[PDB]
A paper describes a structure:
This paper concerns the [name] proteins [name] and [name], which block signalling pathways leading to the activation of the NF-κB transcription factor and thereby diminish the host immune response to infection. The structures of [name] and [name] are entirely α helical, both comprising seven α helices and adopting the Bcl-2–like fold. Instead these proteins have acquired the ability to inhibit signalling pathways that activate NF-κB.
A52R is an immediate-early VACV gene encoding a 23-kDa intracellular protein ([name]) that contributes to virus virulence. [name] functions by inhibiting NF-κB activation downstream of the IL-1 receptor and TLRs via interactions with IRAK2 and TRAF6. Residue 190 and the first two residues of the polyHis purification tag were also visible in the low-resolution structure. To test whether the N terminus of [name], predicted to be unstructured and removed for crystallisation, is required for anti–NF-κB activity, full length [name] and the [name]ΔN36 truncation were compared for their ability to block signalling induced by IL-1α. Residues 125–135 of [name], which encompass the 11-residue ‘P13’ peptide sequence that in isolation can inhibit NF-κB activation, form the surface loop between helices 4 and 5. This is distal to the [name] dimerisation interface and is appreciably different in length, amino acid composition and conformation to the comparable loops in the other VACV Bcl-2–like proteins. Residues 92–94 and 117–122 block the groove in [name], the C-terminal ends of helices 2 and 4 being oriented closer to each other than in M11, thereby narrowing the groove significantly, and the side chains of Q93, F94 and Y118 pointing directly into and filling the groove.
Author numbering:
A (entry chain B), B (entry chain A): 40 to 189
Write the structure that this text describes.
């Protein structure tokens, strides 16, 4: 049995980055941010800052993609595919920003009670972030948590 | 990619009983019951009646097992082991009541904001309900859904 990541403070080598992200989008997407997070989820939360910088404000994105419309989730996936298509040399930081964007998007859906749309965040991550990039994100998070400790 | 089960109205061969129950406990444990459910979850919700008849009221269990205490999840698992011990020969209907019991317990934890405890419902199901029994539960649900169509 894997741990629950909601209040988890570490990122061990045996912890699977994809599972962490699944639990992150589940809890953020269903419960929201008025909940205590552990140090792990609190580090992932910091990715929101990167997202806003790379892709713009969530307000602008909400309007551009009509996120709460019937087509909103499909519009978000299309947007992610456009980014994947267009970024010439994808970096781990593009992927970090994309995780943050998914997180800001899942908030819009939660606030609207479109609870099941959190699943699209996972669909988006699988399209955009390969296993090599997941490993790089994992190592970044491990280093940042060590720095927080020390 | 499997469908989302929150608003799902069917139960097909490809839909796995354990995944359905994972999502049921996740959604009920995190969002609660003031949410639109599909026909599938609405049938599973009927298992609450079986639970109360077989195991007693949630108020009795909450007290007996000190569910919201530090030890509450472990007390719940101990209790599941007790029931399995005391049942002479387990039937599909014992397993149905047990699913309803998990559901009624997850409500108590949601209400207390012990949000990660829903995971213990899955541990309980794995201890109590084998794949043979899950198959039988699936058949029963499928039958009940046909009646709802008619």
């Amino acid at each position: 049995i894997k741990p629950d990541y909601l209040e988890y403070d570490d990122l061990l080598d045996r912890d699977e980055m994809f599972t962490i992200l699944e639990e992150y989008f589940m809890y953020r997407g269903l419960l929201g941010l008025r909940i205590k997070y552990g140090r792990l989820f609190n580090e992932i939360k910091k990715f929101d800052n990167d997202a806003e910088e790379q892709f713009g404000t969530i307000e602008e994105l909400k309007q551009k993609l009509r996120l709460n419309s019937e087509e909103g989730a499909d519009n978000f996936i299309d947007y992610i595919k456009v980014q994947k298509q267009d970024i010439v040399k994808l970096t781990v930081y593009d992927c970090i920003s994309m995780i943050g964007l998914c997180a800001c998007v899942v908030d819009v859906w939660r606030n609207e009670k479109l609870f099941s749309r959190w699943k699209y965040c996972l669909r988006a991550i699988k399209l955009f972030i390969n296993d090599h990039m997941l490993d790089k994100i994992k190592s970044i998070l491990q280093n940042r948590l060590v720095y927080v400790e020390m």
